Amino acid sequence: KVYKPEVQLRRPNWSKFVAEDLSQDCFWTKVKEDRFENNELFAKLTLAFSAQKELKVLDSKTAQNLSIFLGSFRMPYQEIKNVILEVNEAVLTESMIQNLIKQMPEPEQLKMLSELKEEYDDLAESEQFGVVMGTVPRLRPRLNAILFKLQFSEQVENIKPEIVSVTAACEELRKSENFSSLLELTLLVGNYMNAGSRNAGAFGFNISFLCKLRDTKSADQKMTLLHFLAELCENDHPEVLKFPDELAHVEKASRVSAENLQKSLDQMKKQIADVERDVQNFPAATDEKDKFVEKMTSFVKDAQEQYNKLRMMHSNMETLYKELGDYFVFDPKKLSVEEFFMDLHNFRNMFLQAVKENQKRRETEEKMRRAKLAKEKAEKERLEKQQKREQLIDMNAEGDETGVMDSLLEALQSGAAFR
Amino acid sequence: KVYKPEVQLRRPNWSKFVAEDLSQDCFWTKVKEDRFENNELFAKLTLAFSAQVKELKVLDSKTAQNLSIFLGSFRMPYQEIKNVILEVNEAVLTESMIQNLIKQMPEPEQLKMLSELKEEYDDLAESEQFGVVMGTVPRLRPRLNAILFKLQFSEQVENIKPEIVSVTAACEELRKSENFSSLLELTLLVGNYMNAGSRNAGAFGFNISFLCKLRDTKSADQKMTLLHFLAELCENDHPEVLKFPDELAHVEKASRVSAENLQKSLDQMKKQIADVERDVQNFPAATDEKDKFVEKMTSFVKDAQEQYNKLRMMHSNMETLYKELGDYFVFDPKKLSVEEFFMDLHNFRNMFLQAVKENQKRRETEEKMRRAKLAKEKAEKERLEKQQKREQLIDMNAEGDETGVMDSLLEALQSGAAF
Amino acid sequence: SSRSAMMYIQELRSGLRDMHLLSCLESLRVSLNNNPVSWVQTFGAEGLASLLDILKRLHDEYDSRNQHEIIRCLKAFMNNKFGIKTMLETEEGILLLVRAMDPAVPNMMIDAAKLLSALCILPQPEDMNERVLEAMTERAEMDEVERFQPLLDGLKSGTSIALKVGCLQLINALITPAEELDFRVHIRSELMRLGLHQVLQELREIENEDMKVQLCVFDEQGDEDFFDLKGRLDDIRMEMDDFGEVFQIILNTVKDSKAEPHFLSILQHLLLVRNDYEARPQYYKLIEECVSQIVLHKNGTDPDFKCRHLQIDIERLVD
Amino acid sequence: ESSRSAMMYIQELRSGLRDMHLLSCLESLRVSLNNNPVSWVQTFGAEGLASLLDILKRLHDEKEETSGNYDSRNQHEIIRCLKAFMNNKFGIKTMLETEEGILLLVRAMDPAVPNMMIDAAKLLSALCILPQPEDMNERVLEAMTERAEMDEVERFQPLLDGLKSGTSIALKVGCLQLINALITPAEELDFRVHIRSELMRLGLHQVLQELREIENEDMKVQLCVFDEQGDEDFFDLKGRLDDIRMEMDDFGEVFQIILNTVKDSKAEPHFLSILQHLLLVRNDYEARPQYYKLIEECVSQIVLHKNGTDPDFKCRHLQIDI
Ligand SMILES: OC[C@@H]1O[C@@](CO)(O[C@H]2O[C@H](CO)[C@@H](O)[C@@H](O)[C@@H]2O)[C@@H](O)[C@H]1O
Ligand SMILES: OC[C@@H]1O[C@@](CO)(O[C@H]2O[C@H](CO)[C@@H](O)[C@@H](O)[C@@H]2O)[C@@H](O)[C@H]1O
Ligand SMILES: OC[C@@H]1O[C@@](CO)(O[C@H]2O[C@H](CO)[C@@H](O)[C@@H](O)[C@@H]2O)[C@@H](O)[C@H]1O
Ligand SMILES: OC[C@@H]1O[C@@](CO)(O[C@H]2O[C@H](CO)[C@@H](O)[C@@H](O)[C@@H]2O)[C@@H](O)[C@H]1O
């Protein structure tokens, strides 16, 4: 057959057969095509699956990327130049500035465009804009330093938090006596098991080993050294179970990156040094719209202020950690901060779970003892009821007995048969 | 400190700290070792974690020790063992026992070498006595070989048969399912309208492998697929089609076989009977009457080359059905394995049943939303009518010259009218 | 005439007392009952305020005649859309009307209860009934009684027909205008706890047209409510056909609530149903028919949670 | 005294005696079995017993086909013989060995012949009481059940008829006694409840009201047994509840079990309705908890019915206590 649909539908891109040679005496030959045709069918079907001037300087690629950008941006080329000189943040945005830096012609192209500032109305719209920028002295330094200022507040807050977390963790750990307790307990229990071993009488173990306690199982691998320590705490030292709460920042610290932090700070100090060097080479402003050197010196101050706060906090953070290492006896230099707080975070989580698993074990154990009790009480209750029934008639001894039935009946009459 | 427990306990193989260079002014230096000690702690803990002859003349050193252990667990007379093997006494033989003998038997050279020392028999060690006895049974290795193949024959017949049955049945279930055929015709139709005006338009059939892909053709908003659509069509206008999954009961079993492994597995039962046939034709004439080999392995080689033929039948047949299916649905039987073909179909079947199910939930959800919309309008209209009735008492806005506004209200309350 | 309306305002503000205040209010009444609306606008809000300043002074302190008279003036004052509107704009106007409902002074309460009742009826503003209710509440909180106590006291035997009828009508005026079925049931049930049911049984014996009318209004509304709640169930049956879904919903409802333990005890007791093919469905059925009488309680009231012997009838009412 | 006469009796029995002749023989036989040594009985033994029962079978069969029946005497005399024959360990054991003996005892329970029903019910009750074999009660009951299917009547009918106002105090006491003998020896609580609930559906509860008035020591004894046994069954059911509370404290796990229990049962829809109604519980912070408490009291008083019987599912009024 042949169809003709008004609306072009999405199709199954199969590989077709054609009657000619493709068919023979198969299934497909004996197929009545109208056997299923409705006009409603193709109705419902088409419903669901329907498929509804001239350039005097710039190369051809730049004039086209600007022709785009510019048509979209839409702002007096003069207004733009103004917001750049004033550094008017009332109009500036981070995105806005980055587009400018990416779209901007090269410095040479702008050089050759501000020597053509004679024939202004004669140029393509993509070079009218380029002329206007050819004015602003030290354009790219201007833009970069502006961008940095736009980004500064935000890039501080991707640093402070982490240094806070990690500092907190380091303090929390050193101050948690419930954690100290668990450690002492562990040394005790460990030193007993290691009796007569090479590991006998230890003054301490490495704190990293905590996540391995669990690996120490009983005979029937039904119990671990961690569940044991946790049950001990639960039964005889409830106070220790509270240590997971005395480490609120350990989880956040485990997620930090001491490297990215070290870099992040180091980059901020370079970016200030770069701005600082653009302010110290800057032509004295021709006109009063050029509030640059003014605003950036104000800024390069505040920036170095905040930066130095940060570098403190961070040099302090590194000291805490290095002292953690003195205190619990480990090589700070062998284990990144996060690796360390991850091991600790993992341990804490294991411990919380051990406690839980213990509680469920103890429940399952009650259940099984109580069943034993009731099932045994049952074998007694009945054995005793059976014994009372055999006190009526012993169905096995004296044969030449009569009155057996008269006995049963008197017991029944009197109540005696029932107990 | 120092302990001395009675029972070794499982321990933590931590790395220990010693007071020496290891401690300084750390956490461990300020620990009170006895702070947690009990004799009960160490009691619970000790509970949970406690830790509980004759000279060779032929045989190599290894073989001698193996036979020494085997003949020790086996424990049967070396003369008895000889008998069972000759008579083929099936009341004693086991797959297990005959696979031990083959495993432990000295090389034939080591038996020839011991068969030449049958003189010093009482002087030989156990391992070699056995060797001399077996060094006697003619063509021993072929004899144990043939004897096993017989013990196992039954079982290997029935790892071949049920698979040959499944594929055969599935092949029949398909060829004969008119409800499945229907679904194909309905698919071709829809497909054709959809492909109207493409290179695929007016197709006389599609390749049946393609079914698993129908679902890959989504609607405008990818909320609907060609497969759910086909499945709705059936639900609404052709229920029978929805029974094809039940008409294909063996398809899943067929999807799980291995053409390759049946071919190999049958061909090997061919060579195994041709290896035991010739092991009865080259066989030396029996010297004594306990040697029922040439006798029983001639009654086997007949019955075995008999069942192999019946399987070879079913198997040549089964292959024929699949080559015929290929002719009928138009696909190359040789480019696509049996199991591959039925796995594709089995998968499609599942896709179908599931599309059906998801359609229903969809329709339920469309109901719920509609009834909910009816009720939302019913209520919005309820309250507006009830509010229009409240305002027939008073319009707090019209004329203010009227006195008795409040006398009107009280006569309403008084009579019931206000209600 | 218009000169003496400005005067009233200054007489009320002069500190008249006893019978002098009285003869001034009696005249104020007739002036209001007799001069055209425009004269009342000329008495206006500032004069309303002085009635109300006095009303508050009297309540705070045989005052009866003075207070009651102020109530007759109020009725007169608010016998036109202007007065009513102005009334509503007062901060404590509706509250003082409420405080006038002293079953001690049956005739004052009767008059105040009609005004309040009329207020509940108004189309605008939205939900007058609730603002009346709010005032009833506030009074109730400062006297430390139940907000519906005064209403129930007036329904009690020795009190005049007129007061009875007036209390029931105000009750009907708080309930009937309410949009939400949940609200009506709330209030009805609150009255029932205070003893309403038993009081209605006594008023049913009295041949009195006005009383029959308020009773018929009250009953029909119970009925409509009951009927509406039967409908809630029909919906539920249509939408919650699934054990898991229903189970989870109940769970979220009762969790962290004094109802959780009970729901657990219900489920635990069901497990105790005798494991017999015939009896088990009958237990469940019977449980189900008793749960129905309890939850779909009749007449749009909660069940009496305080009765020590609750009676349940699972025989059919009509055939 | 003679040991040959036991063999003669076996022969007369099989001779086809009728009326007063068969009766005069039974009466002699009753007396022989009651006076001779147990060894005499053994000689009569099984073949004799079987001869008694073949007759009893003929008599119960001619009384189904009749209108006015002097037969009572012979049937009843056969029952008197059985007692005598079972008045020793041998006879009892021999009886239980029969294929139709317990059934024939049951069929002698006709309230219109009270003194015969009395004697036959005593023997049945004695059988229930026995320590060996196990579960004699259930075998007696199986027979009562088979009689019931043949006559097409409730298997506990004849017992309730025997308790009705008209009948002698002696017959009432005998009917209660056999009820007690069917129920009390059973080890399984559910079984005691099943049976008792069954007797109640047939009207047992009202009859009990009447019997508690009767000033009769034998009657009080049987009532006290029945009552005390009911209280003990209630006490057990209450203990199952304490067990459930201890074990099943998780909403989900209990729900899944209730479900598994009612699924594919007439009880499923009722359960769904119950849950739905809980959704309808007024949504108020004070009233909701009280609704649930009231509902829980109602469920408790239904499921833990007192006196170890089921609730009366036909009674259409309940008084929930608080
Ligand atoms: O103020 C009204 C009010 O109080 C609440 C909650 O405390 O109910 C209490 O007051 C009612 C009467 O107003 C009494 O019936 C109480 O038993 C009660 O605890 C409340 O529900 C609400 O709307
Ligand atoms: O639909 C509500 C309702 O129906 C009535 C009378 O038929 O009871 C029926 O439905 C209830 C549940 O609502 C079940 O308990 C039934 O057993 C029953 O026949 C009536 O009580 C009423 O309120
Ligand atoms: O035959 C005893 C018996 O029957 C069962 C199951 O059919 O219950 C029924 O039989 C009793 C009387 O024995 C009647 O009350 C019925 O109404 C009934 O369907 C079963 O309980 C059982 O033990
Ligand atoms: O503990 C069994 C039991 O308690 C009593 C009396 O307190 O009833 C209560 O306990 C139950 C469940 O047993 C709940 O239904 C309650 O609402 C209740 O106060 C008594 O009936 C009895 O047998």
Author numbering:
A (entry chain F): 754 to 805, 830 to 1196
B (entry chain E): 754 to 805, 829 to 1195
C (entry chain B): 132 to 192, 200 to 457
D (entry chain A): 131 to 452
Task: Quote the passages of the study that discuss this structure, keeping the authors' original sentences.
Here we report the crystal structure of an autoinhibitory complex of mDia1 formed in trans between the DID-DD and FH2-DAD fragments of the protein. Only the construct completely lacking the CC region (residues 131–457, DID-DD) yielded crystals in complex with FH2-DAD. These diffracted to 2.75 Å under synchrotron illumination. In the crystal, an asymmetric unit contains four chains each of DID-DD and FH2-DAD, consistent with the heavier mass observed in our ultracentrifugation and MALS data above. These are organized into two dimers of DID-DD (blue and grey in Fig. 2A), each of which is bound to a DAD element (red), and four bridge elements (dark/light green and dark/light tan). The linkers between bridge elements are not observed in the electron density, nor are the connections from bridge to DAD. In the autoinhibited structure presented here, the long axes of the DID elements are roughly collinear, with a relative angle of 167°, and the DD dimer is slightly displaced perpendicularly to this axis. The mDia1 lasso wraps around the post region as seen in Bni1p and Daam1, confirming a universal structure of the FH2 domain. At Leu1169 it connects to a loop that joins to the α-helical region of the DAD (Val1181-Gly1192), which is bound to the concave surface of the DID and ends at Phe1195. The weak electron density for the αT-DAD loop suggests that this element is flexible. The interaction between the DID and DAD is essentially the same as observed in the previously described DID•DAD and DID-DD•DAD complexes with backbone r.m.s.d. of 0.6 Å and 1.5 Å, respectively, between DAD on superimposed DIDs.
Diaphanous-related formins (DRFs) including mDia, Daam and FRL are effectors of Rho family GTPases, which function in processes such as cell migration, cytokinesis, cell polarity signaling, phagocytosis, and cancer metastasis. In isolation, DRFs are autoinhibited through binding of a C-terminal diaphanous autoinhibitory domain (DAD), which immediately follows the FH2 domain in sequence, and an N-terminal diaphanous inhibitory domain (DID).
